[PDB]
Amino acid sequence: NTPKDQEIKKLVDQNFKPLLEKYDVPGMAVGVIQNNKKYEMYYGLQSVQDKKAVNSSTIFELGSVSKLFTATAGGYAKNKGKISFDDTPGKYWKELKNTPIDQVNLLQLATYTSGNLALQFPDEVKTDQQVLTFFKDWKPKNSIGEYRQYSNPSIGLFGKVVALSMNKPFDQVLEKTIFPALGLKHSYVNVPKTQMQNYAFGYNQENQPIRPGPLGAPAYGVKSTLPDMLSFIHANLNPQKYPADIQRAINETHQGRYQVNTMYQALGWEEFSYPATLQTLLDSNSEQIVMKPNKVTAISKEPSVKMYHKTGSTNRFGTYVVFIPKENIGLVMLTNKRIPNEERIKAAYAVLNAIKK
Ligand SMILES: *C(=O)[C@@H]([C@@H]1NC(C(=O)O)=C(S[C@@H]2CN[C@H](C(=O)Nc3cccc(C(=O)O)c3)C2)[C@@H]1C)[C@@H](C)O
Structure with a gap:
């Protein structure tokens, strides 16, 4: 060698x-x-x-x-004009329109600054139906954009929105x-x-x-x-x-x-x-x-x-x-x-x- x-x-x-x-x-x-x-x-x-x-x-x-690939997918969708990082998730997941989580933008979701998303979902959130319900019921806590808390739910929502923007x-x-x-x-x-x-x-x-x-x-x-x-x-x-x-x-x-x-x-x-x-x-x-x-x-x-x-x-x-x-x-x-x-x-x-x- x-x-x-x-x-x-x-x-x-x-x-x-x-x-x-x-x-x-x-x-x-x-x-x-x-x-x-x-x-x-x-x-x-x-x-x-x-x-x-x-x-x-x-x-x-x-x-x-795995989050590095989600990030790359989001960068791909943004640079093809499929999303803007200033958009909010209800633009794409219509059932979140007019809910409090629709006040958080996609960049804030991707970089963990929503102000009220922890490392994991609550234990009782086990199905896709229950994930949607969780995000509809979500309320803010800390000022949106101001605090980083590493979060699987946060970047999961970002990934779901990226997928919706790409119609797959x-x-x-x-x-x-x-x-x-x-x-x-x-x-x-x-x-x-x-x-x-x-x-x-x-x-x-x-x-x-x-x-x-x-x-x-x-x-x-x-x-x-x-x-x-x-x-x-x-x-x-x-x-x-x-x-x-x-x-x-x-x-x-x-x-x-x-x-x-x-x-x-x-x-x-x-x-x-x-x-x-x-x-x-x-x-x-x-x-x-x-x-x-x-x-x-x-x-x-x-x-x-x-x-x-x-x-x-x-x-x-x-x-x-x-x-x-x-x-x-x-x-x-x-x-x-x-x-x-x-x-x-x-x-x-x-x-x-x-x-x-
Ligand atoms: C990373 O995304 C991954 C976590 N990373 C690490 C690590 O040490 O690098 C762990 S280690 C350990 C295994 N499971 C624990 C966990 O998930 N903690 C936790 C914290 C708060 C709530 C819950 C729960 O309700 O289930 C669990 C940490 C871990 C694999 C995870 C975050 O996907």
Whole structure:
């Protein structure tokens, strides 16, 4: 293998491989893209009971990293004139017209600032009918637009509206329009039966395989392979190489919309001035930032040099993605067991700080 192949292999063995034994993770896939060259590393088992090893065809649940595709879909619809970010959801979901949630605009939904949407729906909201009822019954609390609270319902409503604006269901927005535009071959909202042998099992804290809520797809419902996620990073590092409609979509997800301490909220992606200190990257996943409302501040001028990342999990999968435009580099980690977000962020910080230019 090439000297770079061996260097990156050593850095990933040094920084990511020990995490498998440390947290009893059955399988992991780690990818690096640098200067348009992709490097794939696979460890362990996609399914413990089948002794099937993780490989380039293994499909992982991306969990909350799915929001990056919802963001891209929204950027796509906005730049085709199908929505404006100043629109409100009742323009598209007519049953929300003349309700209080129709006072929140689409950008505020996409970036979690409605002022009264928590991490998850209430436990009793279990069906699509009940989701619509929930949004009709919704009342504001904190001043609309002023407080960020990370929220699956919030970006789920944004995704539902994006789909309505494109006259197709959300799963078709991704599987027929967005994934093909990005060149992805094995990314899914619904994994077909022909791929089930490649669909990894996820493992809980007792290392047992389990296998969603309503309106979940835009918030946490995408599945993908390591080669597809490296392709997605390639698109984010080189949007100018893609046709205009998806190029504009991608660029839209890189624009910071407001600031919370050292973090800038873009669409889906979290944005930081580059270089970001390790503490800044860790702070973005603190309990205060992730679970509580935080007052936003308007951006004076966007940082001159930027980097981006996103964590995400399900109860049984973990994901991390990060990229640095100036260095033409990015990294993806997929696991079929959760590990602490700080471990994912620290390991990727070590690798990207050590790789030779
Ligand atoms: C991300 O979008 C995804 C969450 N991310 C993470 C993570 O650690 O990266 C977790 S971890 C853990 C698993 N389930 C918990 C959860 O969802 N908490 C929660 C908070 C408030 C209400 C409820 C509820 O009523 O169900 C649950 C956190 C998690 C997978 C989720 C938000 O989709």
